[PDB]
C-alpha cells in the first residue's frame, strides 16, 4: 500500500506540548557498569599490569597481576552519577594500563584509550561487548601500539533498562584485531593529529568584576585544556591566538567546550560557554572531512546580565540548561593538521601549547548589516499574583542592543509602559491592555551571515514538521484513530518533498567568499544527506506496512534526531531574543525565543516559523526556580508578536498583526511614514463567549493524604476565569457542566483565528477544608471557534470531548475529558449562538456528552494481603466498596483478618451506565475502607482502573559424569549463542513471557497518600501499603448465550469458572537461588559479599555466616526451607545482601514474586516441568508428584478428559496423541518401564489442547533483576533463581537436587626443564668484559605467592648452553567448562575471610640471569597458554619465531588433550623498536597428571628420590 494522508489526522493541534521542564535537560540517575576482562600483547619489559578506568572525575583501579604480558582480571566496577545528559555525555572514559602503582605514587603509563560517555551511549545496545582497547603513549607521537585490553564498556540510565548479554562460557579462541573497541566506520589505524583551535576576538561582554571585565578563552578537549592570554579591561577583547591540542583522529570524544571566563584572583568565573559538538563539523570515510569551522561568530547565553556577588543562576553560564539572557559573542575557528610521524623534525610531545595564529580581517565573516526587532504585545495574562499587584512591563532585548539598562536617527525603546493589572481570579491577573496594545522597537548591528540561520531554518522547519508528524502519529496510536500507515506514509511523503525542496532552495548565491571551510562542505554534506534521506524516505514508505507502524516509528525518530543534529549549526550569527517581566525595575520571569524562527525571508522555508506571527510565551522562572515546587504556578503568559530582519527589509514588518489598528509613536518620531510605533490602538474589537465543556476527569493526581482528591478546576481564557463545582471524594469527577465566560473582548480582526486561537490554560485544584486549593497540575487547550457566518454542524462541530494531558511539572498527573467551543457574539447578539439545553449550573448538551449505554459489572472479591497500619492503628475488619458512574455495591466484611483474610461473599455485582465509545469509560474505582462501628470508615486504599479494555468480556471461539552445572552451562550457552539435556534460561522475569500469570487473578494496588513528583517524593510502591486480589468482568447488560456457556452464571459465583477453593491450603516452599550477575557493589574494595535472605510470612532467614564472599557474579547454589499457608502468605522476597563486619548488612537488591498468582494460575507455575524424565543422576525428576499423576491432576482441575495411558509408550489427552521413551534407567542402570516420559512430553505439548490449552511452565532458571528502595529505576543486579510449591494435601516433597556449586577436578603438573641453547649473553664479565649468562628458568601456573619454584643456576654460559634437569611440582584445581583454575585464598593480608577465584591455566617459562647481590635480571619469556601453546620443536634449530607470530606454521596443542609434550620453545623480549625478537631457547618436558595418578606415583622435588634425575 502506497496511498497516504499529508494533513493532520488527530486533533493534537488543539493540544500544545508546552512544558517548563523538559526531562532531557534535567538531572537523571545514570550508572556506568565497567569490566576489565583481560589484556593481551602489551609492550613492556617485566611489568605488573594494572588497568585503571576513570569515568569523568573519579577512577577505580583493578588488582595487580604480576610478571605477565597477557594478564587476566575479570572484575566489575560501578560508577554513580546524578547529572543531566549533557554533563553525563562529556565525561571521559580512560582505559589505561599502568604498572608498579604503590601506596604514595601513581603508576607508569604504558598506554591509554580515550572514549567519552557520549559514544558509549550511542550504540544500538548502549554498550560494547568483548572489545579490545587500543592503547597509545600520550608522551610520544612516534611510539607504537602499546597493547589491548578486553572490556565491556556499558552505560545505562533510568528509563529503558536495555539488556546485557548473559555471561556464558568464555573459552573462545578470540582474535584481537577482529574485536577492537571501535564504533562503526572508524579505521583501527588511528593517527596523531594536531587540533588548531583559533580564537580571534569577542564583543558584547557584561560587567563581571564589580564596571570591569578581564576575559580569556579556555578550550577543553578529552580532559586536556588550554587557555589564551588575559585581555585586561576590555568588553570587546582581541587575542588572535590558537590553542594547539594533539589527539588521535578520528576522535572518540566528539564534543568541544569553548568558554569565555573572567580572570580573577578571588572568583574566577565563567561568562559564557558554547558547546561545539564535533559530530556535525567532521566526517569520516570516502566523503569524510577534517574537523573545522571558522572564521565565524558564535553566540553564548547564560544568566542575568546584572552584577551579583553570588548567583543561583550560575549553571546557565557554564552551558547547563538553557540560558535566560545574552552574555557575549566570540569569533572562533578550527582546523586539523594530521601529523607525519615519520618526520624526525617535529617535537615528540602532544602537550597543549598556545601560539599566535594568523589573524583575519573583519570582512572575512561578511560585512556588518543593520537589523531591526519589532514587538507588539497583543495579550498578557496569568501573571502570578504572588509577584504582587505592581504595574507590569516587558523588556525585550536581542544581544546587548535594546538592553537599555545593561547593554554596553531612531532611538530604541524596549519597555512597554507601566500599567496596573486587573484581577481575573485569586491566583492570576490579566493585563488590561484592551485596545492599546503596546509595542517596542530595537536596532542592533550584527554581521551578515543570514545564510547560516537560513539553512538552520530549513533544517529545523523540516525537523518541526517531522516532529509534528511523529507526535500526531503517536497520539493517534494512543487514541486509536483510523489507519496509522496512511499518516506515516503522508508525513514521510512530506519528508521527501521537503528534501526535494531543500535540494532546490539552499543552493542559491554560492559566490560569497566569506563562506568558510565548514560552510561549503556542510552545504555539500547536507545536499548529499537530504538526497540520501529522500531515497531512504522512499524506501521506508515501502517498509512501513499494516504490521509495522509501531516499530518503524523508531526509524522515524532516528530521522528526526538526525535532522535535529543537522539543524543545529554551531556557527552562529544572530544572538537570541529574550523577553523579561519587570516589576519595580527588577526581573521576575523570562522567555527565550531563538533568532532564526524570528528571522525574515521572502521564501517561506527560509522564513522562520514565528516570524510575523503571534507566539505564546509562557514565561518561566529563570535558573533553578523554574522547576519543581519553586515554579509550580504560571509566572506569565503572553500572546506576543515578534519580527526580526533587515531594516532594508522592514516594509512588511506589521503585516502579521490583526487588522484594524492605528499607530501612536514616540515624541521624537512623529510624522514619518516608516517610524515604528510605541503603542497601537484598536478601533476594531469583537465580543466573544467561550463555553468550557468540563465533563469529566480521569486518572488524576491524588492531592489528599487519603490517596484521593476533591477536584474542581478553574478554566482560564484571557481576562476571565471561573471555577467548576467542587465534587467531593473522587479521583474521577463527572461535573457534567458548562462554564460560560461571557462578554469577552478580543481586539482586531486576526488572520485565521480559527486555526490559531488564543490558548486556554486549565489548572485543576483539590479543595480542602482550609480554603486552600492545591495545585493539581496544568493542561493546555485550543478552542474550536465558530464565526457568526459559520454553521454549527458536523463534521467540525460540536466540540467532542477528548483527553487533555495534565502535568504537574515534568511528571504526568492525569487526563481531562473536556472540550471547548469559542463563539463570537455577532451582529444579532446572542441569537446566533448554539442553543443551550441544578440552578445556575448548565448541563453538557447532547452531541457533546458521551452516549451512555447499560452495562453490568461483576467483581471477584478474593481477599486482602498485608495491609500496613493507618499511622499507628491495625485494620482487622475491612470492607471493599465500588464506585463506578454513580452505581456500585459493597461486599461482606472480613470478620477476622488475623485468621481468614478473605471476604465471605466471593462475587457481588450491580448494573451501571458506561459510554458507548470504547475509550470514554470512566475509571472503575475500587475503594477498600476499614468498616468500623460508629461510622469510623478509615480509608484503606483505592485502585482506579486506567482502562476497562483489560476487563471487557467477549466470548471465545567423562561425558556420562555430569553434575547439575552441566545442564545449566549448556542452557546458558544456548540462549547466549544432545549430550546434555537443557532447561530454559529465561533472561528476564518469568512474568514477562507469561502475561504475569494473571489469567483471572489480577492484582490491584490500594493507593493511599499523595502521588509523587520527580522531586522529594515517591513514585509507586510507597502508595501501595496493601494490595487487593480479585478480578473484574464488565460487559453489556444483555448477557450473551455463548458467554453464559463458556463463562457460567452462578448465583454466587457468576462469570468466574475454574475457581479454586478459597479455604486455606498449606504449601511447602523451597527456593533454589542459582547464581547472580552484574551485582551492585557494597564495600570499599569495589566488591560485595552476597548472601540470600528470604522473607515469607513468619520466617526470618538470613545467611549471616555462609555468604559467597568477594564475587560480583556469585555462585549461590543454596536451597532454603520455608513453610507457609496459601493464599494468605505470599509476601516473598528473594533478596541479596552484602555482609559487613561492622554495622548492618546492606541490601544490594530485592524482588517480589507474589506466589498466589503463581499457584492458582492455569500455567502451573508451582514448579518447573522438565524436558526429560529420569530417576537417577543429575537429571533427576523434581516434583514429588510424578508426571503421569501431574497430568492426572491437571486433567482433573482443568476439566479435560485424560490421561488415557495405553502402553508405556503413548498417552492421549483430549483427541491428541503423544509419545515418548518407555524405558528409564535407575542409578544401577537397569531398565524399568514407566509412564513418565510420555506424560512429560504431553506436559510440554499442553499448549495445543483445543479448549483448556495452555503452555505450561518448563523447568526454568528465571532471571529477576534486583531493585533497591534507595536507588530505584535502574537494576542493582540480575539474580537468577527458581522456586518450589507443593501442597500438604498431596504427596510430600522428597530430597532436593544437589545444588551445591561444582567441585573442581584435582590435578598436578610436573615440568622438568632439561636444557637451554642460544641464550643471548646479557651479563658482561666483571674484569675482561666477555659476554656470558647465569641461566636459570622460572615457572609457575597461578602466581608468585603460591606456585613459583626456581631452578638451580648454570653459572657463566659461553654460547647459551646449560644443563638442569630440574622438576617442577604444581598441584592445582581445574574445571574444563570455563578453563578456569580454582583456588581459594584471602584478598589481602588483613582480610577476614577466604574467597574462591578463577584464573586461566598458563605455564610461564621465563629465562632469568641470577645475581647474588641485587634483583633478578630478565632475559626472555613465553606465556604457554595451557590450551593454546604451540607445538614443541624437535631440535633447537627447528625452534623459530613462528611459535609466537601470526603465521599458522606451528599449530597449537591442548595439554588437557595431549598430556605429554616434548619440545624446544623460544623466550622473547621486545626491543626499542617494539618488535619481538629471540633472546633465548629452552628445552622442557611438560607432563600433566591427575591427583590420584600423582598419589599412586609419587616423585621427589627437583632431582631427588622417588624417580631421581641426573
Q: Give the interface with Ca ion as residue ranges (CB under 5 A).
A: 209, 214, 262, 264, 703-704, 710, 766, 768, 774, 1082-1083, 1089, 1138, 1140, 1143-1144, 1146, 1323, 1334, 1409, 1411, 1414, 1417
Please identify, using beta-carbon distances, which residue of 773 and 1170 lies nearer to Ca ion: 773
Please identify, using beta-carbon distances, which residue of 1111 and 1263 lies nearer to Ca ion: 1111
The answer to whether the beta carbons of residues 674 and 650 sit under 8 Å apart is: yes
- State in angstroms the smallest separation of the CB of 1155 from Ca ion: 29
> What's the rounded Cα separation, in Å, for the pair 271 and 328?
8
Nearest to 192 by CA among 142, 257, 243: 142
- State in angstroms the smallest separation of the CB of 208 from Ca ion: 6
- State in angstroms the smallest separation of the CB of 218 from Ca ion: 14
Task: For residue 1036, give the H/E element and its range.
Answer: strand 1024-1036
> What's the rounded Cα separation, in Å, for the pair 333 and 297?
9
The answer to whether the beta carbons of residues 720 and 712 sit under 8 Å apart is: no
- State in angstroms the smallest separation of the CB of 618 from Ca ion: 25
> What's the rounded Cα separation, in Å, for the pair 360 and 1311?
74
Residue 1082, preceding bond cis, omega within 30 degrees?
Answer: no
The answer to whether the beta carbons of residues 429 and 419 sit under 8 Å apart is: no
Please identify, using beta-carbon distances, which residue of 519 and 766 lies nearer to Ca ion: 766
- State in angstroms the smallest separation of the CB of 581 from Ca ion: 30
> What's the rounded Cα separation, in Å, for the pair 465 and 563?
11
> What's the rounded Cα separation, in Å, for the pair 608 and 457?
6
> What's the rounded Cα separation, in Å, for the pair 556 and 495?
10
- State in angstroms the smallest separation of the CB of 327 from Ca ion: 15
Please identify, using beta-carbon distances, which residue of 1144 and 1328 lies nearer to Ca ion: 1144
Please identify, using beta-carbon distances, which residue of 1146 and 1361 lies nearer to Ca ion: 1146
- State in angstroms the smallest separation of the CB of 1409 from Ca ion: 4
> What's the rounded Cα separation, in Å, for the pair 405 and 395?
10
> What's the rounded Cα separation, in Å, for the pair 590 and 578?
7
Residue 156 grid cell? 545505562
Residue 1000 grid cell? 483471572
Please identify, using beta-carbon distances, which residue of 264 and 312 lies nearer to Ca ion: 264
Please identify, using beta-carbon distances, which residue of 726 and 1024 lies nearer to Ca ion: 726
Residue 1420 grid cell? 626472555
Nearest to 55 by CA among 166, 151, 187: 151
- State in angstroms the smallest separation of the CB of 88 from Ca ion: 26
Q: What residue has cell string 578463577?
A: 1398
The answer to whether the beta carbons of residues 996 and 990 sit under 8 Å apart is: no
The answer to whether the beta carbons of residues 1244 and 1259 sit under 8 Å apart is: no
Please identify, using beta-carbon distances, which residue of 5 and 269 lies nearer to Ca ion: 269
- State in angstroms the smallest separation of the CB of 178 from Ca ion: 39
β partners of residue 1182: none
> What's the rounded Cα separation, in Å, for the pair 1342 and 1168?
40
Q: What residue has cell string 517480589?
A: 1152
Please identify, using beta-carbon distances, which residue of 463 and 1321 lies nearer to Ca ion: 1321
> What's the rounded Cα separation, in Å, for the pair 115 and 113?
7
Four-residue CA torsion sign, 741, 744, 746, 750: positive
Please identify, using beta-carbon distances, which residue of 1017 and 1291 lies nearer to Ca ion: 1017
Please identify, using beta-carbon distances, which residue of 605 and 1323 lies nearer to Ca ion: 1323
Please identify, using beta-carbon distances, which residue of 209 and 633 lies nearer to Ca ion: 209
- State in angstroms the smallest separation of the CB of 1140 from Ca ion: 4
Complete DSSP assignment for 809-825:
SSSEEEEEEEEEEEEE-
Nearest to 148 by CA among 50, 34, 41: 41
- State in angstroms the smallest separation of the CB of 237 from Ca ion: 12
Q: How many CB atoms lie within 10 A of CB 210?
A: 8
Nearest to 131 by CA among 75, 183, 181: 181
Residue 340 grid cell? 607525519
Please identify, using beta-carbon distances, which residue of 261 and 451 lies nearer to Ca ion: 261
β partners of residue 563: none
- Give backbone dihedrals phi and psi of 534, rounded to 5 degrees, phi first: -65, -45
- State in angstroms the smallest separation of the CB of 1392 from Ca ion: 10
DSSP character at residue 1345:
T
Please identify, using beta-carbon distances, which residue of 425 and 1393 lies nearer to Ca ion: 1393
- State in angstroms the smallest separation of the CB of 1146 from Ca ion: 4
- State in angstroms the smallest separation of the CB of 710 from Ca ion: 4
The answer to whether the beta carbons of residues 813 and 807 sit under 8 Å apart is: yes
Between 450-478 and 517-543, two packed helices, what is the crossing angle to 10 degrees? 20
Residue 482 grid cell? 483510523
- State in angstroms the smallest separation of the CB of 107 from Ca ion: 23
Please identify, using beta-carbon distances, which residue of 871 and 1414 lies nearer to Ca ion: 1414
DSSP character at residue 56:
T
Residue 674 grid cell? 516608516
- State in angstroms the smallest separation of the CB of 259 from Ca ion: 15
- State in angstroms the smallest separation of the CB of 781 from Ca ion: 25
Burial class from Cβ neighbours inside 10 Å (0-12, 13-18, 19+) for residue 421 reads: buried
| CA dihedral of residues 1008, 1010, 1014, 1017 (deg, nearest 10) | -80
Going from the C-alpha of 1011 to that of each of 191, 399, 716, 1019, the distances in angstroms are 55, 43, 25, 7
- State in angstroms the smallest separation of the CB of 455 from Ca ion: 37
- Give backbone dihedrals phi and psi of 1035, rounded to 5 degrees, phi first: -155, 165
Amino acid at each position: 500500500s502506497v496511498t497516504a494522508l499529508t494533513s493532520n489526522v488527530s486533533n493534537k493541534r488543539s493540544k500544545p506540548d508546552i512544558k517548563m521542564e523538559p526531562s532531557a535537560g534535567r538531572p537523571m540517575d545514570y550508572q556506568v557498569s565497567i569490566t576489565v576482562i583481560e589484556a593481551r600483547q602489551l609492550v613492556g619489559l617485566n611489568m605488573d599490569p594494572v588497568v585503571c578506568v576513570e569515568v569523568g572525575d573519579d577512577k577505580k583501579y583493578t588488582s595487580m597481576k604480576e610478571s605477565t604480558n597477557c594478564p587476566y582480571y575479570n572484575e566489575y566496577f560501578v560508577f554513580d552519577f546524578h547529572v543531566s545528559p549533557d554533563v553525563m555525555f562529556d565525561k571521559i572514559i580512560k582505559i589505561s594500563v599502568i604498572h608498579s602503582k604503590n601506596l604514595l605514587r601513581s603508576g607508569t603509563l604504558v598506554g591509554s584509550f580515550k572514549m567519552d560517555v557520549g559514544t558509549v551511549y550511542s550504540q544500538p545496545e548502549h554498550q560494547f561487548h568483548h572489545k579490545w582497547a587500543i592503547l597509545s603513549d600520550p608522551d610520544d607521537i612516534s611510539a607504537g601500539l602499546k597493547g589491548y585490553v578486553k572490556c565491556d564498556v556499558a552505560v545505562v540510565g533510568k528509563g529503558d533498562n536495555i539488556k546485557t548479554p548473559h555471561k556464558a562460557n568464555e573459552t573462545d579462541e578470540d582474535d584481537i584485531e577482529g574485536n577492537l573497541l571501535l564504533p562503526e566506520g572508524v579505521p583501527p589505524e588511528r593517527q596523531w593529529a594536531r587540533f588548531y583551535v583559533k580564537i580571534y576576538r569577542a564583543e558584547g561582554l557584561p560587567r563581571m568584576n564589580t564596571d570591569l571585565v578581564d576575559p580569556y578563552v579556555q578550550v577543553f578537549f578529552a580532559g586536556q585544556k588550554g587557555k589564551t592570554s588575559v585581555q585586561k579591561s576590555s568588553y570587546e577583547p582581541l587575542w588572535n591566538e590558537q590553542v594547539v591540542f594533539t589527539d588521535l583522529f578520528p576522535p572518540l570524544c566528539k564534543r568541544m567546550k569553548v568558554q569565555i571566563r573572567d580572570s580573577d584572583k578571588v572568583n574566577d568565573v565563567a561568562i559564557g560557554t558554547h558547546f561545539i559538538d564535533l559530530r556535525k563539523i567532521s566526517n569520516d570515510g570516502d566523503k569524510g572531512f577534517l574537523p573545522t569551522l571558522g572564521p565565524a561568530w558564535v553566540n553564548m547565553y547564560g544568566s542575568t546580565r546584572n552584577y551579583t556577588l553570588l548567583d543561583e543562576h550560575q549553571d546557565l553560564n557554564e552551558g547547563l540548561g538553557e540560558g535566560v539572557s545574552f552574555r557575549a559573542r566570540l569569533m572562533l575557528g578550527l582546523a586539523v593538521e594530521i601529523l607525519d610521524t615519520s618526520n624526525p623534525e617535529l617535537t615528540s610531545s602532544t602537550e597543549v601549547q598556545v601560539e599566535q595564529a594568523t589573524p583575519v580581517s573583519e570582512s572575512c565573516t561578511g560585512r556588518m548589516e543593520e537589523f531591526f526587532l519589532f514587538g507588539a504585545f497583543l495579550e498578557a495574562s496569568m501573571i502570578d499574583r504572588k509577584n504582587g499587584d505592581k504595574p507590569i512591563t516587558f523588556e525585550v532585548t536581542i544581544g546587548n542592543y535594546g538592553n537599555e539598562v545593561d547593554g554596553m536617527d531612531l532611538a530604541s525603546v524596549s519597555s512597554t509602559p507601566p500599567m496596573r493589572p486587573q484581577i481575573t481570579d485569586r491566583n492570576y491577573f490579566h493585563l488590561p491592555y484592551l485596545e492599546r496594545k503596546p509595542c517596542i522597537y530595537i536596532k542592533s548591528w550584527w554581521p551578515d551571515q543570514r545564510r547560516r540561520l537560513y539553512n538552520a531554518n530549513i533544517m529545523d522547519h523540516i525537523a518541526d514538521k517531522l516532529e509534528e508528524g511523529l507526535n500526531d502519529v503517536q497520539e493517534m496510536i494512543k487514541t486509536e484513530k483510523s489507519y496509522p500507515e496512511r499518516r506515516l506514509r503522508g508525513v514521510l511523503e512530506e519528508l521527501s518533498c521537503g528534501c526535494h525542496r531543500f535540494l532546490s532552495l539552499s543552493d542559491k548565491d554560492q559566490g560569497r567568499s566569506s563562506r568558510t571551510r565548514l560552510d561549503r562542505e556542510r552545504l555539500k554534506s547536507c545536499m548529499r544527506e537530504l538526497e540520501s534521506m529522500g531515497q531512504q524516505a522512499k524506501s521506508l514508505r515501502a517498509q512501513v506496512k499494516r504490521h509495522t507502524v509501531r516499530d518503524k516509528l523508531r526509524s522515524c525518530q532516528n530521522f528526526l534526531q538526525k535532522l535535529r543534529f543537522l539543524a543545529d549549526e554551531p556557527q552562529h550569527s544572530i544572538p537570541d531574543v529574550f523577553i523579561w517581566m519587570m516589576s519595580n525595575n527588577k526581573r521576575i520571569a523570562y522567555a527565550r525565543v531563538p533568532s532564526k524562527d524570528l528571522l525574515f525571508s521572502i521564501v517561506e522555508e527560509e522564513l522562520g516559523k514565528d516570524c510575523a506571527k503571534v507566539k505564546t510565551l509562557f514565561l518561566k522562572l529563570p535558573g533553578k526556580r523554574g522547576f519543581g515546587s519553586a515554579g509550580w504556578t504560571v509566572q506569565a503568559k503572553l500572546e506576543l508578536y515578534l519580527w526580526l530582519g533587515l531594516s532594508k527589509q522592514r516594509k512588511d514588518f506589521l503585516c502579521g498583526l490583526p487588522c484594524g489598528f492605528e499607530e501612536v509613536k514616540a515624541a521624537q518620531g512623529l510624522g514619518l511614514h516608516s517610524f515604528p510605533p510605541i503603542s497601537l490602538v484598536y478601533t476594531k474589537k469583537q465580543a466573544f463567549q467561550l463555553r468550557a465543556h468540563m465533563y469529566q476527569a480521569r486518572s488524576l493526581f491524588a492531592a489528599d493524604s487519603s490517596g484521593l482528591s476533591d477536584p474542581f478546576a478553574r478554566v482560564f481564557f484571557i481576562n476571565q476565569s471561573q471555577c467548576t463545582e467542587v465534587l467531593n471524594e473522587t479521583l474521577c469527577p463527572t461535573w457534567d457542566q458548562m462554564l460560560v465566560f461571557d462578554n469577552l473582548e478580543l481586539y482586531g480582526e486576526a488572520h485565521e483565528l480559527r486555526d490559531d486561537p488564543p490558548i486556554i490554560v486549565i489548572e485543576i485544584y483539590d479543595q480542602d477544608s482550609m480554603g486552600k486549593a492545591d495545585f493539581m497540575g496544568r493542561t493546555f487547550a485550543k478552542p474550536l471557534v465558530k464565526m457568526a457566518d459559520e454553521a454549527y454542524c458536523p463534521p467540525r462541530f460540536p466540540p467532542q470531548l477528548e483527553y487533555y494531558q495534565i502535568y504537574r511539572g515534568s511528571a504526568t498527573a492525569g487526563d481531562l475529558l473536556a472540550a471547548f467551543e469559542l463563539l463570537q457574539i455577532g451582529p444579532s447578539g446572542k441569537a446566533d449562538l448554539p442553543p443551550i439545553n441544578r440552578g445556575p449550573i448548565m448541563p453538557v448538551p447532547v452531541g457533546i456528552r458521551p452516549v451512555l449505554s447499560k452495562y453490568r459489572v461483576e467483581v471477584l472479591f478474593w481477599g486482602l494481603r498485608d495491609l500496613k497500619r493507618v499511622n499507628l492503628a491495625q485494620v482487622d475488619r475491612p470492607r471493599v466498596d465500588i464506585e463506578c458512574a454513580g452505581k456500585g455495591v459493597q461486599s461482606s466484611l472480613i470478620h477476622n483478618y488475623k485468621k481468614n483474610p478473605n471476604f465471605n461473599t466471593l462475587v457481588k455485582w450491580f448494573e451501571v451506565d458506561l459510554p458507548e465509545n470504547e475509550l470514554l469509560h470512566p475509571p472503575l474505582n475500587i475503594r477498600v475502607v476499614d468498616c468500623r462501628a460508629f461510622g469510623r470508615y478509615t480509608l484503606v486504599g483505592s485502585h482506579a482502573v486506567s482502562s476497562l479494555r483489560r476487563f471487557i468480556y467477549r466470548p471465545p471461539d567423562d561425558e556420562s559424569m555430569l553434575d547439575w552445572w552441566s545442564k545449566y552451562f549448556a542452557s546458558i550457552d544456548t540462549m547466549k549463542e544432545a549430550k546434555i539435556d537443557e532447561l530454559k534460561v529465561y533472561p528476564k522475569e518469568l512474568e514477562s513471557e507469561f502475561d504475569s500469570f494473571e489469567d483471572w487473578l489480577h492484582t490491584f494496588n490500594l493507593l493511599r497518600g499523595k502521588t509523587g513528583d520527580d522531586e522529594d517524593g515517591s513514585t509507586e510502591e510507597e502508595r501501595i501499603v496493601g494490595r487487593f486480589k480479585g478480578s473484574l468482568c464488565v460487559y453489556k447488560v444483555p448477557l450473551p448465550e455463548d458467554v453464559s456457556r463458556e463463562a457460567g452464571y452462578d448465583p454466587t459465583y457468576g462469570m468466574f469458572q475454574g475457581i479454586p477453593s478459597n479455604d486455606p491450603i498449606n504449601v511447602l516452599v523451597r527456593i533454589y537461588v542459582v547464581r547472580a550477575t552484574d551485582l551492585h557493589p557494597a564495600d570499599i574494595n569495589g566488591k560485595a559479599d552476597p548472601y540470600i535472605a528470604i522473607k515469607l510470612g513468619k520466617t526470618d532467614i538470613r545467611d549471616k555466616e555462609n555468604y559467597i564472599s568477594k564475587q560480583l557474579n556469585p555462585v549461590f547454589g543454596k536451597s532454603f526451607d520455608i513453610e507457609a499457608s496459601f493464599p494468605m502468605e505470599s509476601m516473598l522476597t528473594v533478596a541479596v545482601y552484602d555482609w559487613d563486619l561492622v554495622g548492618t548488612d546492606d541490601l544490594i537488591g530485592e524482588t517480589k514474586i507474589d506466589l498466589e498468582n503463581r499457584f492458582y494460575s492455569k500455567h502451573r507455575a508451582t514448579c518447573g516441568i522438565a524436558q526429560t524424565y529420569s530417576i537417577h543422576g543429575y537429571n533427576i525428576w523434581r516434583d514429588p508428584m510424578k508426571p503421569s499423576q501431574i497430568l492426572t491432576r491437571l486433567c482433573k482441575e482443568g476439566k479435560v478428559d485424560g490421561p488415557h495411558f495405553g502402553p508405556h509408550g503413548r498417552v492421549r489427552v483430549a483427541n491428541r496423541v503423544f509419545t515418548g521413551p518407555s524405558e528409564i534407567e535407575d542409578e544401577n542402570g537397569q531398565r524399568k518401564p514407566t509412564d513418565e516420559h510420555v506424560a512429560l512430553s504431553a506436559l510440554r505439548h499442553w499448549e495445543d489442547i483445543p479448549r483448556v490449552g495452555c503452555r505450561l511452565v518448563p523447568e526454568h532458571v528465571e532471571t529477576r533483576p534486583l531493585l533497591n528502595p534507595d536507588k530505584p529505576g535502574i537494576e542493582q543486579g540480575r539474580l537468577e533463581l527458581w522456586v518450589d510449591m507443593f501442597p500438604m494435601d498431596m504427596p510430600a516433597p522428597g530430597t532436593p537436587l544437589d545444588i551445591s556449586p561444582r567441585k573442581p577436578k584435582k590435578y598436578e603438573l610436573r615440568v622438568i626443564v632439561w636444557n637451554t641453547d642460544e641464550v643471548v649473553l646479557e651479563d658482561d664479565d666483571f674484569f675482561t668484559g666477555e659476554k656470558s649468562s647465569d641461566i636459570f628458568v622460572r615457572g609457575w601456573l597461578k602466581g608468585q605467592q603460591e606456585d613459583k619454584q626456581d631452578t638451580d643456576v648454570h653459572y657463566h654460559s659461553l654460547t647459551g648452553e646449560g644443563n638442569f634437569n630440574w622438576r617442577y611440582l604444581f598441584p592445582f584445581d581445574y574445571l574444563a567448562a570455563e578453563e578456569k583454575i580454582v583456588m581459594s585464598k584471602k584478598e589481602s593480608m588483613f582480610s577476614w575471610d577466604e574467597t574462591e577465584y578463577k584464573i586461566p591455566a598458563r605455564l610461564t617459562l621465563q629465562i632469568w640471569d641470577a645475581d647474588h647481590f641485587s634483583a633478578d635480571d630478565f632475559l626472555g619469556a613465553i606465556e604457554l597458554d595451557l590450551n593454546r601453546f604451540p607445538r614443541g620443536a624437535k631440535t633447537a634449530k627447528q625452534c623459530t619465531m613462528e611459535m609466537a607470530t601470526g603465521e599458522v606454521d606451528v599449530p597449537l596443542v591442548s595439554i588437557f588433550k595431549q598430556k605429554r609434550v616434548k619440545g624446544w620453545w623460544p623466550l622473547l623480549a621486545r626491543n626499542e623498536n617494539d618488535e619481538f625478537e629471540l633472546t633465548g631457547k629452552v628445552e622442557a618436558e611438560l607432563h600433566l597428571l591427575t591427583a590420584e595418578e600423582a598419589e599412586k606415583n609419587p616423585v621427589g622435588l627437583a632431582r631427588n628420590e622417588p624417580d631421581p634425575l641426573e
